[PDB]
Ligand binder design. Structure first.
Ligand SMILES: [Mg+2]
Ligand SMILES: [Zn+2]
Lengths: 49, 49, 96, 292, 88, 1126
RNA sequence: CUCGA
DNA sequence: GCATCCGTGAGTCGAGG
DNA sequence: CGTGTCAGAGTGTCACGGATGC
């Protein structure tokens, strides 16, 4: 779920310490599941083959 | 049984294969790849071969 | 060895088929000798059973030349062919 | 479901007694090889430790039968012989597996056939091939859509037997034996000869993962200096290939049929449209669309 | 100490037969340029590994006859190989 | 100024916030953990001021726990005390050269206590050569620097979980009691409203079966658990009742097959959970229980054991949580909340460092020796026993050897550049023994937790399969003797900032609220706003009154790692590319010469000094003599210390570690000052790359999606040239038919190939060697019975007798070339200890000078990576108004997608640093430069600046600097106020139609060069078993046409290509040879045969009692070059 | 084990 | 007659240990 | 060779289906 507080700054302006920290939570789990989502994808592909 | 043993559940397919004493007619893409025959598709079918 | 053969048959291997395949029983549990690198007789690498370590070279050392092609050595029981047989000659253990 | 098992034994003419073994076959030694190590000691396949444990317990049972040992020792020994053959065929199937040194489970015979590391997927559905190489890919705008730039040092080794052939034809080398030494030493004659060899001889380019069939496309090689592969900027969409350190593999078709399949079926110019949707892929994509 | 299935142990390799295939091709070329007597004597001493007297018994010739044929047929091949630049 | 503490170059920082606390020792994690283990005086003195009373080192702690050893009677006793070390056996570099281990002999004082003799013999007993940690924080095992990585593990304690059932959709609860060692114990409430307990993963018994076995009556159980109906249903559904009944029920499920005696189960149920022999909660494990349950929370920590009271309080804690309760006090215990634990929170997740990881291995090794002692006591006589006779140190030293030799924590040190090495020592790894399996790590262990603030970096982590599982310790973070990570904070009393700094653990931080570092603060200390951005427990961010702020952050960059803190304008880059930016800085290659970046962060200085690859002056003095070989310092007192330079040494990863003196003859140098710097260092700062003149524009497609165009100036002037060193090795053994000998005489080789060899058969120093050149001439005797028929004929037709040896010489691998720089020879004849069976050993060091090539991977600090697409001549490059061509052309399209504007902001500030600036002082200070320090109002060309992370330059000041950039020597300002400049197309001459952003960007050469990554193979070695080509470049193997790739062939219908790949080009034993002949003959390609790999498959199915046969069209079985005998 | 796409 | 538990599966390629 | 106290392993995946079992 989304955090009840948004990152108001833009990357041109410059995020604060806390603004940057809360952003990384979604960025890391974004890369993390991208390895798992490709695994179930490549598995579904070889089943279809 | 050769196309199946190379997909999933290798032992479960090989056990039921020797019990029923199944014989595999080597006419299929996955089979001919293993034994080294031309695959029965594309330039491998008897029409173009 | 042409590449057109129709069927590939699989079935249960009779305990009598296992002996039909085997070129001898693996009696001793030893592997080789850890000085001479020569495999022990009736072991898991026995040359009398599976085949010669080197081509045309027997275990006892009597037959080391190619002219004696196909001779079953009397003193060590090893045949004298190429070491290519050591990839295809089956053994067997006779269970009590 | 019982009939499925029972009916099969009846018709086939093979007895169900085969499920109980009186003798176990031993796989030839070269498939369970024992290699020596540079430290003096040895290292053997796990199948040798499994076959050895069956032999050890089977020979101890032979002693108990001769000695008339109590039925409690013979029965408890026979049980261990069953677990040994169970470990040799499929260690870990029943109960806790036979651990080797370091609590590592030993690989049984049936482990040689299962999964990504098994015989089927690792060594039968896919193989390592001769006449192949790999290097970093670098964009080359000057290349035509049917062309690719591969390094000179790559081509010399890739076409090594073909270069040796011409080195003896044009009499740059006396015999084919010395012709091989010329390519390994890179005598200046090979670079002029190598160009004649790769003439209109297509090559295959591939980038993992091979998602669709356009993940492998054929090109006409052009000898370029440097050590990077020069790829056409329009096939980047098909390969999903960016240029931030990617590598591609090269495969050289040898037979006449294989080159013909590369020239007609797999050529990049003959595969502009996506087979999934019919819409083009080799089209202006990044800088090209901004320029237009 | 070690198990091959266990990681950290190098797998065995066998070199390619390229050098052996090329020599076999050149040997087969120089063999055709030999008389039927000489070619049928070197192929019975080095390809079949027989003794000097064994070849004499098969070919129905004298003992020293096999010695003399081998002596020349070897030099005859050295002539054919050196004329093609085969490294000593 | 920035970092005015060691005497470093003056880098001018855009810092608006003062730094209250200076960066600690970045190597403390590896240093402090090992000093405690060996009880060094520095650790002891540190513990003395820490308030400790009688502190005990890690080695002493093992000996005191071990003491004393006694048999069942008590007539014999052995004890240990006073562990001490003698001097080190060999210096650091000598171990690297001779491939030995850096260690010091460990001495202890042992004595035998015999109650029956009234006399004791005490003496000094040598225990073993103990691996010592270098000053750089590394170990040397067999001549290779290794790093013991700190491990993140589940802290010992009692943990509660709120799981949701699958079938009944009711909220379940479970408990785990994880000891520091021994058996585990987990209670749970299933979906049937009943309570049970698994003991050592065995079968789950009803929870009252355990209570009855401990001596609790069935009545006293109802008195304690009567307030819940789920426990009344447990004692009723229970099967067996009786103290001597449920005690045997546990015995038969725990140790089956044994006779159950009332006193054989009374013995183990005490030894497995209440005797310190087979069970132990560490000083942190006991403490984590006494707070979670709320008992003994005031007693001094003396119980190193689980107690029966805890087991009841645990079951009491569980049952209340099941029915919605939120508060509980144990009978006679303080109040504590009832909730579930995160297990990802850094107060429940523990970090064990070098000392503990070694201590546990020592403890296990001592226990193996202890069993030898008790066995040796009851065998030998009770009057000729000395401490030397009872002690067999074989299992002790073999336990520390097995650890450093093989462990997920003992890792081959990352030695690409100094930063990579410093980061490796500060790594925190979840993987390894005692932690977790990679196959059991879900998507929740890997992501960022709010308790990681200021402790573990949220950015620095690999992007491969180890993402999240491996982190880097935050800058100011440290570890307490318990195992948790502390981070400093400034204590705010009543809205008043104080210079008092206190370190708080993870759970200590939640009991307060802390203000963000960039809080507006009065000069006295009072917050400017009543409501300030403040962090609260459970990761909540909100405004809060100024009278509520208890603490505040030390520095803005407190949350990032050292490598992360080196990215200028990091606050303008997204976390995705920021991760790659820090991870690729560790992949930089040390160049021939090194330049410090114009745009810095200030961290570059301390990162280089603390890494330990420079040469810092220990004591103040003057430089007596300086050479390329060594530097001598004459101290004030009169003593001389000489520092030797490491010149052209091969790193772990083949990079060139080369130190160079900085000072000159007769220079006054202060203590702790850099007198010489090594790889990737310039005047003491991390110089991971070079300052390149960059233009942001597409250029004829040569920089198409992330490709890079370089000016050939970087090649002509060795700007991106780097030295690389490879190690080659070969040995001469004893064979069955003789002995391998290293000799210049090699059969059938000209005097021309052997021309670069000396009389021994070794290549000579300085000789340039291409691939295939002989390095060491070794011949091995081959038997006569091993000869080909053609080879025996070929031997006869060349008349060369006495050539029973074949060529096994050491040749240069494919893709290698360089100058031979060093030779090391080891001979059994010359007292050199070789492995048994070896007579000579030779190592040849080859160094290549690698200029930047097409395809070499460059990258910046903002995750902007790319391979070199084209190296244009200097005239082709787009050049500025005064003819100076740019050095690198970065594509514009690859900028706004990645969200890494930091490279654009660095390019702007980079130019201002290159040119300099002068702000209009007349009519006051302008309104954009009011916040800037006075040192920034004027800058000289090629000035150095610091942009600290989350602080540093703001866009208001950066925009103003571009407006006042200094003119060139001709007096013309090349870049506009926008930051763009007018470029000229060097290929045509026409100026480019629009201005282009131009400046200076710090570019690094990453260790991903085409010189290593190019490979090709016609034929070569084949794997003996499968008869398929080998894998990898090093083994000269072929590429793997995988499973997915075969689907592509079939999708094309390319049948012959598919059959060709899997047969004649792969594992067809006869087809591959006949194809090679068919090519050299000019004939056609023959017909593919049967793969040998398929032959092996059949022979393997046969070994599993499967009768596989090949049938022809008629049906007759056909053999495959084999028969069958009986 | 560690890393590259 | 049904809840339990066992066994199955979980991207491809490459470099160094 | 003969053998006479006892000392004692790893533990953070999960979805899904169907044979297994009180
Ligand atoms: Mg890419
Ligand atoms: Zn013999």
């Amino acid at each position: 779920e989304f955090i009840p507080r948004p990152v108001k700054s833009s990357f041109r302006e410059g995020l604060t310490v806390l603004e940057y920290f809360i952003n990384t939570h979604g960025a890391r789990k974004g890369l993390a599941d991208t390895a798992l989502r490709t695994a179930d994808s490549g598995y579904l592909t070889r089943r279809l083959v | 049984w050769l196309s199946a043993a190379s997909f999933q559940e290798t032992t479960r397919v090989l056990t039921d294969a020797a019990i029923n004493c199944r014989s595999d007619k080597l006419n299929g893409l996955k089979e001919n790849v293993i034994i080294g025959k031309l695959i029965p598709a594309g330039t491998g079918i008897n029409r173009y071969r | 060895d042409v590449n057109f053969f129709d069927e590939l048959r699989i079935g249960l291997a009779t305990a009598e088929d296992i002996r039909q395949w085997s070129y001898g029983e693996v009696k001793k549990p030893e592997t080789i000798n850890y000085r001479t690198l020569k495999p022990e007789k009736d072991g898991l690498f026995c040359e009398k059973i599976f085949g010669p370590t080197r081509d045309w070279e027997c275990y006892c050392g009597k037959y080391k030349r190619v002219r004696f092609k196909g001779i079953i050595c009397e003193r060590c029981g090893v045949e004298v062919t190429r070491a290519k047989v050591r990839r295809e000659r089956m053994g067997h253990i006779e269970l009590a | 479901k019982r009939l499925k098992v029972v009916a099969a034994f009846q018709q086939s003419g093979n007895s169900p007694m085969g499920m109980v073994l009186d003798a176990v076959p031993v796989i030839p030694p070269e498939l369970r090889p024992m290699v020596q190590l540079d430290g003096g000691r040895f290292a053997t396949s796990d199948l040798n430790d499994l076959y050895r444990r069956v032999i050890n317990r089977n020979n101890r049972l032979k002693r108990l039968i001769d000695l008339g040992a109590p039925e409690i020792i013979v029965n408890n020994e026979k049980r261990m012989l069953q677990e040994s053959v169970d470990a040799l065929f499929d260690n870990g199937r029943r109960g806790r597996p036979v651990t080797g040194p370091g609590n590592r489970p030993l690989k049984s015979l049936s482990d040689l056939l299962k999964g990504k590391q098994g015989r089927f997927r690792q060594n039968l559905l896919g193989k390592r091939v001769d006449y192949s190489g790999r290097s970093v890919i670098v964009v080359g705008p000057q290349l035509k859509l049917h062309q690719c730039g591969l390094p000179k040092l790559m081509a010399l080794e890739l076409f090594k037997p073909f270069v040796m052939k011409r080195l003896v034809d044009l009499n740059h080398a006396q015999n084919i034996k010395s012709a091989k030494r010329m390519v390994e030493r890179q005598r200046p004659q090979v670079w002029d000869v190598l160009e004649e060899v790769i003439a209109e001889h297509p090559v295959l380019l591939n980038r993992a993962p091979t998602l669709h069939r356009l993940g492998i496309q054929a090109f006409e090689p052009m000898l370029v200096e440097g050590k990077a592969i020069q790829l056409h900027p329009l096939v980047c969409e098909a390969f999903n290939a960016d240029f931030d350190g990617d590598q591609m593999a090269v495969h050289l078709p040898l037979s006449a049929e294989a080159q013909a399949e590369a020239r007609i079926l797999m050529l990049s110019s003959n595969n502009i449209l996506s087979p999934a949707s019919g819409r083009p892929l080799a089209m202006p994509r990044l800088d090209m669309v901004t320029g237009l | 100490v070690g198990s091959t299935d266990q990681s950290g142990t190098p797998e065995q390799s066998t070199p390619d037969e390229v050098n052996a295939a090329l020599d076999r091709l050149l040997i087969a070329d120089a063999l055709a340029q030999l008389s039927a007597e000489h070619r049928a004597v070197i192929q019975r001493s080095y390809y079949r590994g027989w003794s000097t007297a064994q070849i004499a018994t098969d070919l129905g010739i004298a003992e020293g006859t096999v010695k003399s044929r081998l002596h020349y047929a070897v030099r005859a091949l050295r002539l054919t190989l050196q004329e093609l630049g085969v490294t000593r | 100024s920035n970092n005015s503490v060691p005497g470093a170059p003056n880098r001018v920082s855009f810092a608006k916030l003062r730094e209250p606390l200076e960066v600690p020792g970045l190597l403390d994690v590896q240093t402090d953990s090992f000093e405690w283990l060996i009880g060094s005086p520095r650790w002891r003195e540190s513990a003395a001021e820490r308030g400790d009373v009688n502190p005990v080192g890690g080695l002493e702690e093992v000996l005191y726990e071990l003491s004393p050893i006694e048999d069942f009677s008590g007539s014999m006793s052995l004890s240990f005390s006073d562990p001490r070390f003698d001097d080190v056996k060999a210096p650091v570099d000598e171990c690297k050269d001779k491939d030995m281990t850096y260690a010091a002999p460990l001495f202890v004082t042992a004595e035998f206590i015999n109650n029956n003799t009234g006399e004791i013999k005490s003496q000094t007993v040598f225990m073993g050569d103990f691996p010592m940690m270098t000053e750089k924080g590394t170990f040397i095992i067999n001549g290779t620097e290794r790093v013991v990585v700190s491990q993140l593990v589940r802290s010992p304690g009692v943990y509660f979980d709120e799981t949701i059932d699958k079938s009944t959709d009711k909220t379940l609860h479970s408990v785990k009691v994880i000891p520091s060692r021994g058996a585990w114990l987990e209670f749970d409430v299933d979906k049937r409203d009943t309570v049970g307990v698994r003991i050592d993963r065995k079968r789950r018994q009803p929870v009252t079966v355990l209570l009855k076995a401990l001596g609790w009556t069935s009545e006293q159980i109802v008195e304690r658990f009567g307030f819940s109906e789920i426990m009344r249903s447990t004692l009723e559904k229970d099967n067996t009742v009786g103290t001597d009944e449920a005690l045997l029920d546990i015995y038969r499920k725990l140790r089956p097959g044994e006779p159950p005696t009332k006193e054989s189960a009374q013995t183990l149920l005490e030894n497995l959970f209440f005797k310190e022999k087979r069970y132990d909660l560490a000083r942190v494990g006991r403490y984590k229980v006494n707070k979670k349950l709320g008992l003994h929370v005031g007693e001094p920590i003396t119980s190193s054991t689980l107690t029966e009271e805890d087991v009841v309080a645990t079951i009491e804690y569980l049952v209340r949580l099941h029915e919605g309760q939120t508060t509980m006090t144990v009978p006679g215990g303080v109040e504590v909340p009832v909730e579930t634990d995160d297990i990802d929170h850094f107060g429940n997740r523990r970090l064990r460092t070098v000392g503990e990881l070694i201590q546990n291995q020592i403890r296990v090794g001592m226990s193996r020796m202890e069993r030898v002692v008790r066995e040796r006591m009851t065998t030998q006589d009770v009057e000729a026993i000395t401490p030397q006779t009872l002690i067999n140190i074989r299992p002790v030293v073999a336990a520390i050897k097995e650890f450093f030799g093989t462990s997920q924590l003992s890792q081959f040190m990352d030695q690409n550049n100094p930063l990579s090495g410093l980061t490796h020592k500060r790594r925190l790894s979840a993987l390894g023994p005692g932690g977790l399996s990679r196959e059991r790590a879900g998507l929740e262990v890997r992501d960022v937790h709010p308790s990681h603030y200021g402790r573990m970096c949220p950015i620095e982590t690999p992007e491969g399969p180890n993402i999240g599982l491996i982190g880097s310790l935050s800058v100011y973070a440290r570890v307490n003797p318990f195992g948790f990570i502390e981070t400093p904070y400034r204590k705010v009393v009543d809205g008043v900032v104080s210079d008092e700094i206190v370190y708080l653990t993870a759970d200590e931080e939640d009991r307060h609220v802390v203000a963000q570092a960039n809080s507006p603060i009065d000069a006295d200390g009072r917050f400017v706003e009543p409501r300030v951005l403040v962090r609260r427990k459970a990761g909540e961010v909100e405004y809060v009154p100024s009278s509520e702020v208890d603490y505040m952050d030390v520095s803005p960059r407190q949350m990032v790692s050292v490598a992360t803190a080196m990215i200028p304008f990091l606050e303008h880059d997204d976390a995705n590319r920021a991760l790659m930016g820090a991870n690729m800085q560790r992949q930089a290659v040390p160049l021939v010469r090194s330049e410090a970046p114009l745009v810095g962060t200030g961290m570059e200085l301390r990162a280089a000094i603390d890494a330990g690859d420079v040469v810092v002056a220990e004591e103040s003095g003057v430089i007596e003599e300086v050479s390329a070989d060594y530097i001598t310092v004459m101290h004030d007192n009169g003593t001389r210390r000489t520092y030797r330079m490491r010149k052209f040494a091969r790193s772990n990863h083949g990079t060139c570690a080369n130190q160079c003196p900085i000072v000159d003859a007769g220079d006054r140098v202060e203590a702790g000052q850099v007198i010489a710097d090594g790889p990737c260092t310039d005047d003491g700062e991390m110089a991971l790359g070079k300052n390149l003149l960059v233009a942001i524009m597409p250029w004829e497609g040569h920089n198409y999606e992330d490709a890079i165009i370089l000016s050939n100036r970087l090649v002509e002037e060795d700007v991106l040239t780097s030295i690389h060193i490879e190690e080659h090795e070969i040995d001469a053994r004893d064979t069955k038919l003789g002995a391998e000998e290293i000799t210049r005489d090699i059969p059938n080789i000209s005097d021309e190939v052997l021309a670069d060899l000396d009389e021994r058969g070794i290549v000579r120093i300085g000789a340039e060697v291409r691939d295939g050149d002989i390095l060491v001439g070794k011949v091995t005797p081959k038997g006569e019975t091993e000869l080909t028929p053609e080879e025996r004929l070929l031997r006869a037709i060349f008349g060369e007798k006495a050539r029973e040896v074949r060529d096994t010489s050491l040749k240069v691998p494919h893709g290698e070339s360089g100058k031979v720089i060093g030779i090391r020879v080891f001979s059994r004849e010359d007292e050199d200890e070789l492995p048994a069976g070896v007579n000579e050993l030779v190592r040849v060091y080859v160094a290549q000078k690698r200029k930047i090539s097409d395809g070499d991977k460059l990258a910046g600090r903002h995750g902007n990576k790319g391979v070199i697409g084209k190296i244009l001549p200097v005239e082709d490059m787009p050049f500025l108004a005064d003819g100076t061509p740019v050095d690198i052309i970065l594509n514009t399209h690859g900028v706004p997608r990645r969200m890494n504007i930091g490279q654009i902001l660095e390019t702007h500030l980079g130019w201002c640093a290159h040119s300099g600036w002068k702000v209009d002082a007349a009519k006051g200070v302008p309104d954009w430069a009011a916040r800037l320090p006075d040192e920034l109002l004027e800058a000289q060309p090629n000035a150095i600046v610091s942009t600290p992370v989350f602080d540093g330059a703001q866009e208001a000041e950066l925009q103003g600097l571009l407006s006042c950039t200094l003119p060139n020597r001709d007096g013309d300002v090349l870049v506009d106020a926008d930051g763009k400049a007018m470029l000229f197309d060097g290929r045509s001459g026409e100026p480019f139609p629009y201005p282009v952003t131009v400046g200076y960007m710090y570019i690094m050469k990453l260790h991903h060069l085409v010189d290593d990554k190019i490979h090709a193979r016609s034929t070569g070695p084949y794997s003996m078993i499968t008869q398929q080509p080998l894998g990898g470049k090093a083994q000269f193997g072929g590429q793997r046409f995988g499973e997915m790739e075969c689907w592509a062939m079939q999708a094309y219908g390319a049948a012959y290509t598919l059959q060709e790949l899997l047969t004649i080009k792969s594992d067809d034993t006869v087809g591959r040879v006949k194809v090679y002949e068919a090519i050299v003959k000019g004939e056609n390609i023959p017909e593919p045969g049967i793969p040998e790999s398929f032959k092996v498959l059949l022979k393997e199915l046969q070994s599993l009692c499967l009768n596989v046969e090949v049938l022809s069209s008629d049906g007759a079985a056909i053999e495959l070059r084999e028969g069958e005998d009986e």
